C-alpha cells in the first residue's frame, strides 16, 4: 500500500495509479511572474457560517476534520467555479522540518505545511461521483509558515494526542473553519488533480496567496502523529507531501495584480 516512504512514496504511485503521469497532475510550482492576472476572475465566495464539523480522523496519510455535507451549509462558490461546492473535510500536509511540507510551491519556495479544504460539486450529488468528473472537486489550499500561533488552529492541535495512530477518530463538533483563513482571498487557480491516490484529475485548485502563521508548538504536535497503526513500529507522520509535478499544457491564473 501507498505512502510517503522510500519504497511506497510518490515516485512509486504511478504503478497502482497510472494517471500519476497524466496531463493535469497536482501539486505544481506556482511561478508568480508567469501566472497571468485574469481580471474576469470573480472573488471567491466562502460561506462557512453554518458549517457542522463532525469528527477528526487519522487516516494513515494525514489527519482530517470531516463536515456534514448532506446540505449546503459550508460552501465555496464564485472565483473560477461554476456552481456550488460543499465542504467535505480539511486536512494538512507537513514536513519533518519547517523548510518543507507544502505540496504547492511558490517560485520554488516550500512552506512548513499546507491546509486543504476539500469541496465537491453539488451537481454530481456525492463525492464518489464528483471525483470521476473534470470539474468535480474544488480544493482551497492555504500555506502555513512558522511564526506567531494561529488561535483558531489550537482546538485541532489539542486533540491530536487522541488520534495518534492510523484509524483512530474522535468527536470534533463545533469547529469553525473560518478561524483558519488568512485576511485576503487573493488566489491562483489551475486545473489539476488529487495529490493523493487515486490522483484523479477532478480538481479546480484555488491556492491562496497569503499564508497563515502557525507556531512551532502547533506544528510540532502535527509531527507527533504516526503513519502506523497502534502496535506496529512507530513511524512519525511527517513529510506527507507530494512534490511538484510537471505543469505541461496548463496556465496558472491569478485573481490579483
Ligand atoms: N484512495 S485512498 O487511499 O482511499 C485515499 C482517498 C483520498 C480522498 B477521498 B475523496 B476526497 B476524499 B478526500 B479527496 B478525494 B478521495 B481524495 C481525499 C484526500 C485529499 C486529496 S487532496 N490532497 O486534497 O488532493 B479523501
Ligand atoms: Zn491534501
From Swiss-Prot:
Residues 1-256 form the Alpha-carbonic anhydrase domain. It is an enzyme of class 4 (lyase). Changing residue 194 to A: Reduced CO(2) hydrase activity. It holds the Pfam family Carb_anhydrase. Changing residue 194 to E/H/R: Strongly reduced CO(2) hydrase activity. The keyword Metal-binding applies. Gene3D superfamilies: Alpha carbonic anhydrase. Target of drugs used in treatments against glaucoma disorder and breast cancer. This is Carbonic anhydrase 2.
Amino acid at each position: 500500500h501507498w505512502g510517503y516512504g522510500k519504497h511506497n512514496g510518490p515516485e512509486h504511485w504511478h504503478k497502482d495509479f497510472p494517471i500519476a503521469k497524466g496531463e493535469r497532475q497536482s501539486p505544481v510550482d506556482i511561478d508568480t511572474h508567469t501566472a497571468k492576472y485574469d481580471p474576469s476572475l470573480k472573488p471567491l465566495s466562502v460561506s462557512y457560517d453554518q458549517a457542522t464539523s463532525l469528527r477528526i480522523l487519522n487516516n494513515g496519510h494525514s489527519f482530517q476534520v470531516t463536515f456534514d455535507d448532506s446540505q449546503d451549509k459550508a460552501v465555496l462558490k464564485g472565483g473560477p467555479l461554476d456552481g456550488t461546492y460543499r465542504l467535505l473535510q480539511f486536512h494538512f500536509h507537513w514536513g519533518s522540518l519547517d523548510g518543507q511540507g507544502s505540496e504547492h510551491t511558490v517560485d520554488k519556495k516550500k512552506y512548513a505545511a499546507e491546509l486543504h479544504l476539500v469541496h465537491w460539486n453539488t451537481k454530481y450529488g456525492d463525492v464518489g461521483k464528483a471525483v470521476q468528473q473534470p470539474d468535480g472537486l474544488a480544493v482551497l489550499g492555504i500555506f502555513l509558515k512558522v511564526g506567531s500561533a494561529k488561535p483558531g488552529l489550537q482546538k485541532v492541535v489539542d486533540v491530536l494526542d487522541s488520534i495518534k495512530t492510523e484509524g483512530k477518530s474522535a468527536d470534533f463538533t463545533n469547529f469553525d473553519p473560518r478561524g483558519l483563513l488568512p485576511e485576503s482571498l487573493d488566489y491562483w487557480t489551475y486545473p489539476g488533480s488529487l495529490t493523493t491516490p487515486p490522483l484523479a484529475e477532478c480538481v479546480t485548485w484555488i491556492v491562496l496567496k497569503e499564508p497563515i502563521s502557525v507556531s512551532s508548538e502547533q506544528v510540532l504536535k502535527f509531527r507527533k502523529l504516526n503513519f502506523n497503526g497502534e502496535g506496529e513500529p512507530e513511524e512519525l507522520m511527517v513529510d506527507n507531501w507530494r512534490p511538484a509535478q510537471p505543469l505541461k499544457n496548463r496556465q496558472i491564473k491569478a485573481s490579483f495584480k
